[PDB]
Design a protein around this ligand. Structure first.
Ligand SMILES: Cc1cc(C#N)nc(N2CCN(S(=O)(=O)c3ccc(NC(=O)c4cc(CN5CC(CN)C5)ccc4N(C)S(C)(=O)=O)cc3)CC2)n1
Ligand SMILES: Cc1cc(C#N)nc(N2CCN(S(=O)(=O)c3ccc(NC(=O)c4cc(CN5CC(CN)C5)ccc4N(C)S(C)(=O)=O)cc3)CC2)n1
Ligand SMILES: [Mn+2]
Ligand SMILES: [Mn+2]
Ligand SMILES: [Mn+2]
Ligand SMILES: [Mn+2]
Lengths: 229, 229
């Protein structure tokens, strides 16, 4: 049971989601082989030096799971691309690249956030290009926190381009893609590498949580309500 | 692990779905405590005397699960309201009423197909009234098969009315509703009986299968692709 979650959008204004996530980490995650968070863990991020107490509660909760012997990994989303090595160290999470090919019990699965598949939004992709330029990140991060805050203040999700999906799955020569970003949880069948292929999409956390569970024989998208209190 | 499925729409034209369902019965269902099929098992039904070979393949498959010690139950959908005691006997399924209150490990859950919640479609509800009138059923069933076939030949699903949902859950004084019909798989939070309540909606089988799994502590909506061949 390797688990994948994404699009939690954690924030001070939404304690119910935080509580749901902690319940998950304390419970489900402990039994897993591993946990991958495929981005948008946080609703926003202006750097690891944010003293926001939510960041340390979450880091602790995740580190307790790493310490229990369950490795956690993180791929950045569009919201939390500035999560850095200091958060990694406090949470014990390992930071991965924007695309990764896993070998899950012999099954080869491409994981990403999914925003890069959304090639029909020039708007977003121009933005992403800039905020992913390292010197623009280093610049922003060197501003005083209170100014980073002011900047962020001012600041419908386009769905994936079908071709971009195929291309990605072909580049990795894979039959399996898990991603988030779009907040449209679903299982999709398609063709890639001349064969049947599946794109499994995670949901955002608000009413419910969602995960993907990958076992030797099965791949399941699971929704769960926040009922267990 | 009590399981709920619905909206399979089984038919000769869709062998892939049949194969997916058989895989499920041979696999997942065997480990369950029980299986509830909440309607639209079949795309159509003109009476238990249909010699359609698909009907006997399915009856056998389900009966093998009943025989393995896993009780199967059926609530009619809008498509297969004419499933009768002869199919029940051949499949070993027990036929339930349009609404049922289960006690699942101390948790009280209302199950139905869901069509009765769709009170905004007069069209459909007028139709349903008539085709559920026993003498209109007895009439239709007494016509020669070939004429039933001719009749069926000529023959967007409206979503649930939010109030009808509340009313149903209030009538049964329940915090949990599982249903199908709408083909919009999801978990929904609402208020009923002055408290948090959840409506869990199953999906139709085409790309994927879906189930709801109810355990002592958890209620999960699960999508799964047809990958395991
Ligand atoms: C390195 C650096 C520099 C500067 C500066 N200087 N600022 C930062 N921020 C750090 C991150 N924070 S943040 O966490 O608060 C954040 C804020 C907004 C987004 N925006 C998008 O991701 C985004 C954006 C668009 C397109 N932009 C064009 C149009 C603007 N006119 C819209 C469309 C959709 C979106 N997403 C789908 S969406 C709908 O989820 O937001 C992302 C992160 C803000 C400051 N970083
Ligand atoms: C007892 C008896 C008598 C007679 C007669 N004599 N016929 C039968 N049939 C047995 C069942 N078969 S069936 O299995 O082939 C079947 C066919 C159609 C439906 N129709 C609906 O369920 C239905 C219908 C509408 C509304 N009707 C009004 C409008 C018609 N002008 C549309 C809207 C939506 C629908 N559903 C959501 S939908 C979109 O899924 O179909 C159901 C079962 C047909 C014969 N039974
Ligand atoms: Mn998101
Ligand atoms: Mn995103
Ligand atoms: Mn249906
Ligand atoms: Mn139906």
């Amino acid at each position: 049971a390797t688990l994948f979650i994404a699009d939690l959008h954690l924030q001070t204004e939404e304690p119910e989601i935080t509580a749901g996530f902690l319940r998950f980490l304390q419970g489900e995650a402990r039994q897993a082989d591993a946990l991958y968070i495929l981005g948008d863990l946080f609703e926003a991020w202006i750097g690891d030096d944010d003293p926001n107490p939510l960041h340390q509660q979450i880091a602790s909760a995740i580190k307790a799971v790493v310490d229990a012997g369950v490795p956690c990994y993180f791929i950045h989303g569009n919201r939390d691309f500035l999560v850095g090595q200091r958060f990694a160290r406090q949470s014990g999470m390992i930071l991965l690249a924007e695309e990764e090919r896993l070998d899950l019990y012999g099954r080869e699965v491409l994981i990403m956030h999914g925003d890069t598949l959304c090639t029909d939004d020039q708007g977003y992709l121009a933005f992403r290009a800039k905020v992913h330029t390292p010197w623009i990140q280093r610049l922003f991060l060197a501003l005083p926190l209170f100014i980073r805050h002011r900047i962020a203040a001012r600041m419908e999700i386009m769905d994936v381009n079908p071709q971009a999906v195929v291309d990605a799955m072909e580049r990795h020569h894979v039959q399996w893609l898990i991603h988030g970003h779009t907040h449209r949880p679903a299982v999709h069948e398609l063709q890639a590498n001349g064969q049947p292929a599946w794109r499994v999409v995670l949901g955002a956390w608000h009413s419910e949580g969602s995960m993907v569970k990958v076992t030797p024989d099965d791949v399941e998208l699971i929704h769960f309500p926040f009922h267990h209190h």
